[PDB]
C-alpha cells in the first residue's frame, strides 16, 4: 500500500533509450528513464519518466518510484521459499540459496534483488529480456512471498507445528 | 597351476607390491583371483600385512608360493603353522 | 502431445550442419572412400590467383586464389595481409574461416606457414600473418 518516505534510499539508473516521434518535418527525440529505489533492508520500488534531456528525465523517474514500495519478507538474507512470478512474458524463477554463496541472476533483476537487501539467491530469466517487463515480473514475484508467521496466523495451528 | 606371488604397483622409481594369489598364465599385473595382504620393500625394515587365514587355506587346497613370498611367509610364522598342522593330522 | 503419443512416436531432433565441408575429406585412395578425417587444415596447389570485387555496400578489390585440395575437391580461398608471393602452381595450406563481404569463398590460407611468404612489414601483430620478430 502507501508507504511513506522517512528512511534512506538508493538509486541505480538501470537503462535509458532515446525514443523519437515523427512530425511533419523531421523527428523529435525524447529520453526515457528506468530507475528502482530501495534502502537495502527490505523495501523496493521502481518508476519511470521522460524528458528532453537525460538528467531531467532521471530526476523525474527518481521522484516517481518513491511512491511504490513493497515489503520483500526475508529470513536470514534469503527468500523464505521458492516462487515464480509472471507478467506479460516475464517468466522469472527464484529459489533460496546457501549462506555466503552469492546472487546468480541476470542484470535487470540483479538490480532489484540487490537494492532490496538480498544476500544469497538464484534465478534465471525465461523468455522476455526487455528491461521493463522483466522488472515488473520480478516485483510481481516478490509480491508473492508467503511467511511463517502469516501462515501460522492464517491456518488454525501455530508455527513449529507447520514444519 | 594356481600360484600366489607378487604384483608391482609403484610408479617410476618407488615400487610397491601386494601379495595376490593368481593363476600362472595371467600376466604380471593382469587379472587375478583375490588379494592377500601387501608388503613394502622400500623403507627397510620391510613392512608387511597379511590375513593369515586366506593363505592357510590356499596352501591347504594346494598352491605354490614363489621364492620371495616364501621368505616373507616364513618370517611370519605361516609356513611353520602349515607344516605344523598338516604333517601331523 | 499426450504422453501416449510420444510413446508411439519417436520425437526426433534437427541435426546441425558443418561450416567447412572440404576439411572432412570424402576419401579417394585407393578406392575413393568415406569421411572420418575432420582435420584442422589441408593443403593444395594454387591453380590461379587474381582479384575480385565484393558486394555492395562495401568497395574494394579482394585478392583471392583458386586452389585444388589434395582430397580431389575444388575450393576458392582467400589470402590475407598486404601483398603476397602466390602464383600459379604453388602448394599452400588452408585455414578454415568464413568471410562475409565476399560470396563464394569460405576458406582462407595461412600466411607464412608454407610456400607462401610472411608479410614483410608488420610490427605489432606478427603472430598471425607469420612474421618473425625483428631482432634489428
Amino acid at each position: 500500500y502507501i508507504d511513506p518516505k522517512h528512511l534512506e534510499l538508493e538509486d541505480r539508473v538501470v537503462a535509458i533509450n532515446r525514443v523519437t516521434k515523427v512530425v511533419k518535418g523531421g523527428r523529435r527525440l525524447r529520453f526515457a528513464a528506468l530507475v528502482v529505489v530501495g534502502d537495502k533492508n527490505g523495501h523496493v520500488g521502481f518508476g519511470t519518466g521522460k524528458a528532453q534531456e537525460v538528467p531531467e528525465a532521471i530526476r523525474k523517474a527518481i521522484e516517481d518510484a518513491k511512491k511504490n514500495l513493497v515489503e520483500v519478507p526475508m529470513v536470514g538474507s534469503t527468500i523464505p521459499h521458492e516462487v515464480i512470478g509472471v507478467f506479460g512474458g516475464g517468466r522469472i524463477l527464484m529459489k533460496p540459496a546457501v549462506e555466503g554463496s552469492g546472487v546468480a541472476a541476470g542484470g535487470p533483476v540483479r538490480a532489484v534483488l540487490e537494492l532490496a537487501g538480498v544476500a544469497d539467491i538464484t534465478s534465471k530469466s525465461l523468455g522476455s529480456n526487455t528491461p521493463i517487463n522483466v522488472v515488473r515480473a520480478t516485483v510481481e514475484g516478490l509480491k508473492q512471498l508467503k511467511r511463517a508467521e502469516e501462515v501460522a496466523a492464517l491456518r488454525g495451528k501455530s508455527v513449529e507445528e507447520i514444519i | 597351476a594356481v600360484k600366489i606371488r607378487l604384483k608391482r604397483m609403484g610408479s617410476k622409481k618407488s615400487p610397491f607390491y601386494r601379495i595376490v594369489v593368481a593363476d600362472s598364465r595371467s600376466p604380471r599385473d593382469g587379472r587375478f583371483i583375490e588379494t592377500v595382504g601387501t608388503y613394502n620393500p622400500l623403507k627397510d625394515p620391510a613392512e608387511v600385512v597379511l590375513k593369515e587365514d586366506l593363505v592357510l587355506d590356499w596352501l591347504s587346497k594346494g598352491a605354490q608360493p614363489s621364492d620371495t613370498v616364501r621368505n616373507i611367509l616364513s618370517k611370519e610364522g605361516v609356513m611353520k603353522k602349515h607344516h605344523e598342522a598338516k604333517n601331523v593330522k | 502431445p499426450t504422453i501416449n503419443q510420444l510413446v508411439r512416436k519417436p520425437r526426433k531432433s534437427k541435426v546441425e550442419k558443418s561450416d567447412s565441408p572440404a576439411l572432412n575429406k570424402g576419401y579417394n585412395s585407393f578406392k575413393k572412400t568415406q569421411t572420418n578425417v575432420n582435420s584442422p587444415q589441408k593443403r593444395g596447389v594454387c591453380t590461379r590467383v587474381g582479384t575480385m570485387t565484393p558486394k555492395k555496400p562495401n568497395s574494394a578489390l579482394r585478392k583471392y586464389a583458386r586452389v585444388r585440395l589434395s582430397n580431389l575437391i575444388e575450393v576458392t580461398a582467400y589470402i590475407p595481409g598486404i601483398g603476397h608471393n602466390l602464383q600459379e602452381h604453388s602448394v599452400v595450406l588452408l585455414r578454415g574461416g568464413r568471410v562475409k563481404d565476399l560470396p563464394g569463398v569460405r576458406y582462407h590460407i595461412v600466411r607464412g606457414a608454407l610456400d607462401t611468404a610472411g608479410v614483410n612489414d608488420r610490427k605489432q601483430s606478427r603472430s598471425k600473418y607469420g612474421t618473425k620478430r625483428p631482432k634489428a
Binding site: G100, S101, G102, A104, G107, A119 | - | -
Partner: protein, 201 residues
C-alpha cells in the same frame, strides 16, 4: 613469471596501499596512464568484480592457474562463508606468515627469505613459498646464518602483532594461535564480488 611491476602502478591503480599501509600518495590519487589525470565513464558491473579480484590477487603475488585451484580448495569446508573461508585459507600460506611474523617488511622480501632456504618449520628446512602452514607449527629461523642485518632490523620494527600470532624476539620463534577471521583480516575490500566472479568464471 613472478613479479616485475614497480608496485606503485598496482597500488596506484586499484587505490589500496598494497601494502605499505601508508600510500606514497603524491600523484597516486588518479590511476596510472596518460589517461589517468582525467576521469572517464563509469565502471561496468563486470569491471567492478574484476577490480575486486585483481586487487585481492596482487596483495600476494600469485598466478591465475593457481588462484582458481586455491578457490576451489576452499569450496568444500562445508562451514561458513565460502569467501570468508577462502580468505582464511589465503592467510595460511608461508610467505604470509613470514610477513605477518614481521621478519620482512614486504611480501617480496619474505619471498626472498623463504625462497633462498633461509628459514624452516619444526626444524627441517622448507623452501617452497606456497607451503600450507598448518595451525600450531612453530616456524624456526634456521639459525646457521641468521646474523643478516635485515633479519634483525625488520624484527626491530615490533609495531604490531595480530591477536593470532605469538612470537619472541630472542630465538626469532613465531607460531599461530588460532584461525583468523574477517573482522581482523585485512579490511575491507569484499568477498561477495569474488565469490560471484567465479560463477561467470
Amino acid at each position: 613469471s613472478r613479479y616485475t611491476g614497480p608496485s606503485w602502478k598496482v597500488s596506484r591503480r586499484l587505490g589500496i596501499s598494497l601494502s605499505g599501509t601508508g600510500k606514497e600518495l603524491a600523484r597516486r590519487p588518479y590511476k596510472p596512464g596518460q589517461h589517468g589525470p582525467n576521469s572517464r565513464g563509469k565502471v561496468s558491473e563486470y569491471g567492478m568484480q574484476l577490480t575486486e579480484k585483481q586487487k585481492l590477487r596482487h596483495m600476494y603475488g600469485m598466478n591465475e592457474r593457481q588462484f582458481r585451484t586455491l578457490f576451489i580448495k576452499a569450496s568444500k569446508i562445508k562451514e561458513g562463508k565460502h569467501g570468508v573461508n577462502f580468505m582464511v585459507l589465503l592467510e595460511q600460506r608461508l610467505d604470509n606468515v613470514v610477513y605477518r611474523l614481521g621478519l620482512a617488511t614486504t611480501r617480496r622480501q619474505a619471498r626472498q627469505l623463504v625462497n633462498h632456504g633461509h628459514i624452516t618449520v619444526d626444524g627441517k628446512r622448507v623452501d617452497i613459498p606456497s607451503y600450507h602452514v598448518e595451525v600450531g607449527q612453530v616456524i624456526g629461523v634456521r639459525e646457521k646464518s641468521q646474523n643478516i642485518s635485515t633479519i634483525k632490523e625488520a624484527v626491530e620494527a615490533t609495531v604490531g602483532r595480530p591477536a593470532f600470532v605469538s612470537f619472541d624476539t630472542e630465538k626469532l620463534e613465531g607460531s599461530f594461535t588460532r584461525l583468523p577471521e574477517r573482522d581482523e583480516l585485512y579490511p575491507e575490500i569484499d568477498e561477495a564480488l569474488v565469490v560471484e566472479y567465479y560463477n561467470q568464471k
